[PDB]
Design a protein around this ligand. Structure first.
Ligand code: SF4
Ligand SMILES: [Zn+2]
Ligand SMILES: [Zn+2]
Ligand SMILES: [Zn+2]
Lengths: 339, 97, 512, 60, 105, 158, 50, 81
């Protein structure tokens, strides 16, 4: 006796459906965590480590030993994923524009978009419309954005929101509690009173406090996206099945399989540029327990920001000369673009 | 491979892909850019839309939904090169008729 | 809002089955649409959707409304849906304040969604009649007494009635009756033609036709925050303060809006007489007392004047803020220990202050305190004002000024509260499912023992039914019952914090 | 995979190569000299020996 | 109008009264009737029954037609509300006329 | 002081036991005085004064004990007391300078008083998830799950 | 006819092409590759292979 | 080198539950009522389906069910049970 087996069914691709992945899903898809900066053992054999990059439990890049995960050789190993995790969250550089647009769209205090219910009515009418095209969705993006930038208070929470401004490349700030050209509101009193002890211990703060702005850095921005009401999400034009907004902020990365990045000369660009990320993480975790000041802590944080950005593409401009890249490098974008 | 020093065969550029289109040759274009250059065979899980291996889908933990396609190797490479970039092409399957 | 959704989904499934709650969560995640379209999006037939939405309207988790061009949509009530687990406290409160009659009244009120006066009184009487024997019975008089005591105290209140649809808009009637609500008769009970007693039932003419009623939940919530504040002052100063606070609040029940940050002041002359005769405090001693509670820097109560005796006002908004911050301090204390509460209180009072300006105050040395401050960023309780010295905005030339914002913190924890509850409940469901074989076996053998238990009893079955492997396994089910009891106790012993947190955030709302 | 190595140890190594560059002999002299040095840097007596004995041990 | 309109007046011309229509011009554009122009062929406004007849002839839906934007001069000229079809009669080098249908958005 | 670091700074280390025993003993007396004052149980208006403790009074008491052979200073003991308010333990009140031998404020003098905690331990801190460190990583779909979490299973027992 | 059937004169440019074709892979194969791909994932586009 | 385990230890221990008589009475009512309500006709299980072939026992041990009685004068026109 035996159960009938459907041997093979001829199958044809119908669609390619793009989308993002949330860090939880990202863990679920990968195979091993990688936790080591180094890649070979100290001994003479040049054998690869068991938990570093280039562990052959992810793939093969040579002819003489198999991939452990599926026990076959370089001829037919389809490659498998690992993952790494970052101590502090990070902007994706790619979707950076999306992050700033979302932050401009939402209310910074209550996470509800600043729409009147008539506007919501019209706009959900446009959404039900059959045959939505990319051009058309761009159009609703334009009209949404226009009808929402010109509004200052929030109907839902009763507060009012400033504007978001670039404060250097790959960091963003907001114009909330500055001194205002419309003259400051009585809330300036509690502002002033809040720096009382700071001024008493440091009088140099007093000349400076009038220039303060809202410090929405990646971590607090991430905490904000965790809270958008489920109703609003489609009105941000994101397909709710593709991805939640939190995925635009990343706390884990995939290491691609070895077959993407073979290694014999014996370096390969991504295999080493990625070693720097895992290096810097080890630093900040060691630095996490040092008793060091806030200063160098946030430096070693944003240095990840520089590194991830260079991991995706190498042509960024707003990089100061003292840690500007020393040489050309092939991120992902460089190997997709070009003749 | 690329050149006569290493016996690389000859390149059928984009500009001959166009001349082959104009004649309306559909089987010769397929033959001359897939089944001779770099045809390859791959496992796809129909339920989740990701790739799998050896008839298994490590993502879903099952061997029932997987299926084997013919595909250019360069495309197989392209998807794996996009996922890590945090852009994910999920595949939706259907019958061949 | 994924955590909320995970709660309500499984709660609606618990209370109505796995066939309806998909519909409920679709409306909860989309707001309002007519039936034609939701039928398609859920991929479910007309009849199933109808027999669902009738139920949800009955318990008013979903509403309905006629919209433009005459279509009727169903509006999900995003809050009401997830208020359900608050029922235990309603039952507890009504049994505390009133006899068991009101307790059995309220359970029927919620279980059926809505009932008319004759319906509720008759049903509650009928089940009560099972609770005593020997021809003893109760009258509708006492039940009506309890109900009207609920009504004038505004804990139980009328439904929305229909408009005069029988004599308005002649011709084709509107798609829906479009019920209406008013306050004029809204605690006014109708005079029932029914008289007499509850009657026992075979289990096989209405004057108040359509006059349904429902408990006023927010009346309980007002009472709860009153409970919290009086408990707080009793813990802080004495029970006597609790009575006088209970006094001016029971005067202030209808003198101010439920969500107002304050109350219009009563005089100590009025409090001196409104206080119960069981208290021996004199007027001058009373006045000096309220002087102390008004002088308390926690400032729950303010003076605001002296016209016609001692004017005194309770500060509702700051009372809520006080309890919410106390809860914040409590959770950080237990989650990380007292020294964390120290540093948090430092920044709480020293609104902006640096690490090198607090190590003296905190008297905990370097290489442990600075790290201790950094870990607190991971839970977003802190902030850092980073004011720059130069237009360069270089990190070497800015001041790293710590800060705290209360509202952001409280909003965050609410998610942690929800997911905590969800994990506990889904854990119980997980064990119950995986133990379903044990449960089915135990229920079967318990039914077997229930058979022949006393009628037609014999000894050949009173020891053999537990003889098998259930002997070491019954204690596993009993231990499982202890686990169920522990997690259930967590259910009730979580959401008091949710009450105070939610009240504080909702009262923060200006609604411009 | 280059170990950080003791600061004094690499200071000595630098003397090794600064010595062989004087005579400007073919490079493999430098590398093999380094190997012999590392082999010699595996005993307590040499480690505790005064730096003058180290200055001579590179020479030999 | 002689020299244009104020921004407020320009704004009101889209929503003043949905029951009324107030197409706007300047004398500039009416010094010549564009139908007399060489470069533009003849138009006809087309009727619902013939709409059904045509899209039956080819078995289409109206989203599968070419387009003419409302703001286009002749569209303004005949004042056609969007969602209609106009027949275009393209002259040819011979007696054969070239007929073609275009949908207004 | 940036060089001597007072009595607390010793041999390039910090006498943790010394300051901690000061903290615990000073609150011991603060709560003792508060409870004995309230045991009078006559009038809250007089408890408004009787419950509070003078910094000079408690300094005299604690130096009378002589726990530490190193000197206990006036402002030192005052700052030791200043930790308890931020420990959420004591209250503060200022009166005229005629109290005590010192009168440690210009024309004024300031007192301390033990304080009850406003609320019991919450229900939330009784939930294991509240204490769970992998809270972000626990998912029903995740390999760490409520259907798998050890902290909960172990929390069933005690 | 191609240049004008959409109701507007559409140049044969990287901008013009974006307004004439809906699919993702093709445009990403001509110009503006990175931006097309990233924003395409943001909108959650399905892309029928035709 | 060796990646941390899945469950690290914790220094603090969650606070034990408090015990109360009225509250225990509530929890009692809890696991009672949650099983009681599922009998009220608003609860819906799967409608009877997939019976192999007719045999008369389903005539004697037949299940009894009748259509519910909502208020016909409160819900829209399409409400008929
Ligand atoms: S592992 Fe257990 S205790 Fe931790 S968050 Fe998950 S369910 Fe809660
Ligand atoms: Zn493999
Ligand atoms: Zn808002
Ligand atoms: Zn799969």
């Amino acid at each position: 006796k035996e159960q009938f087996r459907e041997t093979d069914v001829a199958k044809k691709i119908s669609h390619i459906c793009f989308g993002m992945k949330s860090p939880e899903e990202m863990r679920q898809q990968a195979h091993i965590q990688v936790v080591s900066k180094n890649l070979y053992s100290q001994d003479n054999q040049h054998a690869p480590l068991l938990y570093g990059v280039l562990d052959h439990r992810m793939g093969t890049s040579e002819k003489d030993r198999p991939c452990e995960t599926c026990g076959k050789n370089l001829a037919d190993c389809l490659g498998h994923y690992g993952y790494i995790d970052l101590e502090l969250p990070c902007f994706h550089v790619g979707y950076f524009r999306a992050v700033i647009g979302i932050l401009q769209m939402i209310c910074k205090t209550c996470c509800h978009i600043m729409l009147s219910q008539e506007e919501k009515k019209q706009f959900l009418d446009y959404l039900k419309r059959p045959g939505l095209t990319y051009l058309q969705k761009r159009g609703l993006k334009k009209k949404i954005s226009d009808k929402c930038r010109k509004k200052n208070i929030c109907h839902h929470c009763g507060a009012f929101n400033g504007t978001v401004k670039k404060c250097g490349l790959l960091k963003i700030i907001h114009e909330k509690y500055k001194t205002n050209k419309k003259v400051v509101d009585p809330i300036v009193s509690n502002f002033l009173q809040s720096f009382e002890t700071a001024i008493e211990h440091n009088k140099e703060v007093e000349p400076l406090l009038g220039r303060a702005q809202e410090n929405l850095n990646p971590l607090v921005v991430l905490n904000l996206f965790k809270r958008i009401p489920a109703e609003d999400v489609p009105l941000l034009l994101m397909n709710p099945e593709a991805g939640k907004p939190s995925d635009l902020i990343l706390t884990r990365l995939l290491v691609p399989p070895l077959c993407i990045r073979p290694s014999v000369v014996n370096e390969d660009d991504l295999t080493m540029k990625l070693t720097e990320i895992i290096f810097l993480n080890d630093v900040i975790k060691k630095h996490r327990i040092s008793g060091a000041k806030t200063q160098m802590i946030m430096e070693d944080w944003d240095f990840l920001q520089l590194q991830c950005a260079l991991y995706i593409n190498s042509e960024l401009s707003g990089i100061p000369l003292n840690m500007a890249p020393k040489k050309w490098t092939r991120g992902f974008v460089q190997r997709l673009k070009g003749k | 491979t690329e050149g006569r020093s290493r016996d690389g065969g000859l390149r059928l550029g984009e500009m001959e892909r166009d001349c082959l289109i104009g004649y309306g040759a559909s089987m010769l274009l397929l033959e001359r850019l897939m089944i001779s250059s770099d045809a390859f065979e791959v496992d796809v899980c129909g339920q989740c839309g990701l790739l799998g291996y050896s008839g298994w889908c490590h993502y879903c933990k099952s061997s029932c939904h997987v299926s084997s396609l013919r595909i250019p190797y360069a495309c197989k490479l392209l998807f794996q090169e996009l996922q890590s970039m945090n852009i994910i092409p999920r595949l939706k399957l259907s019958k061949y008729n | 809002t994924q955590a909320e959704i995970k709660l309500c989904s499984l709660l609606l499934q618990e209370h109505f089955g796995e066939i309806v709650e998909k519909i409920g969560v679709h409306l909860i995640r989309t707001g309002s649409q007519p039936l034609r379209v939701i039928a398609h999006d859920t991929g479910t037939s007309l009849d199933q959707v109808k027999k669902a939405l009738c139920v949800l309207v009955q318990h008013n988790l979903v509403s309905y409304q006629v919209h433009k061009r005459g279509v009727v949509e169903y509006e999900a009530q995003c809050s009401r849906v997830l208020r359900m687990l608050r029922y235990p406290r309603y039952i507890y409160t009504t049994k505390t304040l009133y006899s068991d009659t009101g307790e059995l009244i309220v359970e029927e009120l919620l279980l059926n969604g809505k009932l008319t006066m004759s319906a509720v009184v008759k049903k509650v009487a009928d089940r009560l009649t099972e609770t005593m024997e020997d021809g003893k019975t109760m009258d509708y008089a006492e039940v009506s007494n309890t109900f009207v005591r609920l009504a004038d105290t505004h804990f139980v209140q009328r439904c929305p009635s229909v408009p005069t649809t029988e004599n308005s808009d002649p011709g084709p009637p509107p798609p829906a009756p479009t019920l209406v609500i008013n306050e004029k008769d809204m605690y006014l009970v109708p005079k029932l033609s029914l008289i007499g007693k509850g009657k026992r039932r075979r289990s096989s003419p209405i004057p108040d036709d359509g006059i349904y009623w429902q408990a006023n939940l927010d009346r309980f919530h007002q009472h709860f925050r009153d409970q919290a504040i009086v408990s707080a002052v009793a813990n802080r100063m004495d029970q006597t303060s609790s009575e006088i606070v209970r006094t001016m609040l029971r005067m202030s029940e209808i003198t101010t809006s439920s969500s107002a940050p304050f109350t219009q002041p009563l005089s100590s002359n009025e409090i001196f007489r409104s206080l119960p005769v069981g208290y021996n405090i004199s007027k001058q001693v009373l006045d000096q007392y309220l002087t102390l509670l008004a002088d308390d820097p926690l400032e729950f109560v303010g003076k605001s004047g002296d016209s016609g005796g001692g004017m005194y006002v309770i500060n509702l908004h700051k009372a809520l803020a006080s309890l919410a911050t106390a809860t914040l301090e409590s959770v950080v204390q237990e989650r990380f220990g007292s020294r964390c509460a120290r540093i948090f209180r430092l920044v709480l009072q020293k609104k902006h202050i640096e690490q090198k300006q607090v190590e003296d105050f905190a008297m905990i040395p370097a290489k442990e305190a600075k790290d201790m401050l950094y870990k607190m960023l991971s839970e977003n309780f802190m902030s850092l004002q980073e004011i720059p010295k130069t237009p360069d905005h270089a990190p070497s030339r800015t001041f790293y000024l710590y800060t705290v914002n209360i509202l952001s913190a409280a909003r965050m924890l609410l998610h942690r509260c929800y997911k905590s509850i969800a994990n506990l409940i889904e854990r119980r469901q997980f064990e119950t499912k995986e133990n379903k074989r044990l449960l089915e076996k135990s229920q079967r053998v318990e039914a077997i023992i229930a058979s022949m238990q006393a009628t037609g009893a014999e000894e050949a079955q009173l020891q053999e039914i537990e003889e098998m492997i259930t002997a070491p396994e019954r204690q596993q089910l009993e231990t499982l019952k202890r686990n169920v009891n522990k997690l259930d106790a967590s259910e009730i012993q979580v959401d008091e914090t949710i009450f105070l947190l939610e009240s504080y955030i909702e009262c923060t709302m200006k609604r411009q | 995979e280059n170990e950080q190595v003791s600061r004094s140890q690499q200071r000595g190594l630098r003397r090794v190569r600064d010595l062989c560059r004087v005579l400007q002999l073919p490079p493999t002299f430098e590398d093999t000299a380094v190997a012999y040095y590392q082999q010699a840097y595996r005993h307590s007596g040499i480690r505790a020996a005064r730096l003058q004995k180290k200055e001579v041990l590179v020479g030999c | 109008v002689q020299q244009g309109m104020t921004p407020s007046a320009k704004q009101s011309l889209v929503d003043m009264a949905p029951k009324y229509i107030l197409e706007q011009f300047l004398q500039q554009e009416l010094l010549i009737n564009i139908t007399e122009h060489e470069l533009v062929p003849e138009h006809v406004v087309m009727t619902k029954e013939e709409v059904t007849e045509l899209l039956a002839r080819y078995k289409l839906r109206e989203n599968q037609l070419p387009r003419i934007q409302a703001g286009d001069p002749v569209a303004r000229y005949f004042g056609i509300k969007r969602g209609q079809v106009v027949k275009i009669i393209r002259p040819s080098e011979t007696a054969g006329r070239y007929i073609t249908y275009r949908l207004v958005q | 002081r940036s060089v001597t670091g007072g009595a607390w700074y010793s041999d390039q280390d910090f006498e943790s036991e010394f300051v901690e025993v000061l903290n615990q003993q000073c609150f011991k007396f603060l709560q003792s005085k508060a409870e004995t004052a309230r045991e009078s149980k006559q009038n809250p208006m007089i408890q408004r004064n009787s419950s509070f403790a003078s910094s000079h009074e408690v300094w005299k008491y604690i130096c009378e004990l002589g726990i530490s052979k190193v000197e206990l200073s006036m402002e030192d003991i005052e700052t030791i007391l200043n930790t308890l308010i931020y420990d959420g333990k004591v209250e503060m009140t200022i009166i005229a300078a005629k109290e005590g031998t010192v009168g440690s404020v210009d024309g004024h003098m300031k007192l301390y008083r033990a304080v009850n905690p406003i609320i019991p331990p919450t229900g939330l801190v009784r939930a294991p998830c509240g204490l769970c460190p992998v809270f972000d990583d626990c998912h029903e779909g995740g390999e760490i799950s409520p259907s798998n979490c050890i902290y909960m299973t172990e929390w069933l027992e005690f | 006819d191609l240049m004008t059937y959409k109701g507007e004169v559409l140049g044969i440019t990287r901008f013009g092409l974006a307004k004439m074709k809906e699919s993702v892979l093709m445009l990403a194969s001509f110009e503006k590759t990175a931006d097309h791909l990233f924003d395409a994932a943001y909108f959650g586009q399905k892309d029928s292979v035709c | 080198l060796k990646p941390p385990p899945l469950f690290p230890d914790t220094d603090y221990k969650p606070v034990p539950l408090k015990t109360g008589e009225g509250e225990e009475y509530m929890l009692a009512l809890k696991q009672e009522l949650r099983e009681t309500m599922k009998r009220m006709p608003y609860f819906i299980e799967t409608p009877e389906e997939r019976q192999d072939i007719e045999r008369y026992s389903k005539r004697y041990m037949k299940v009894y069910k009748e259509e519910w009685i909502p208020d016909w004068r409160r819900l829209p026109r399409e409400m008929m049970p």
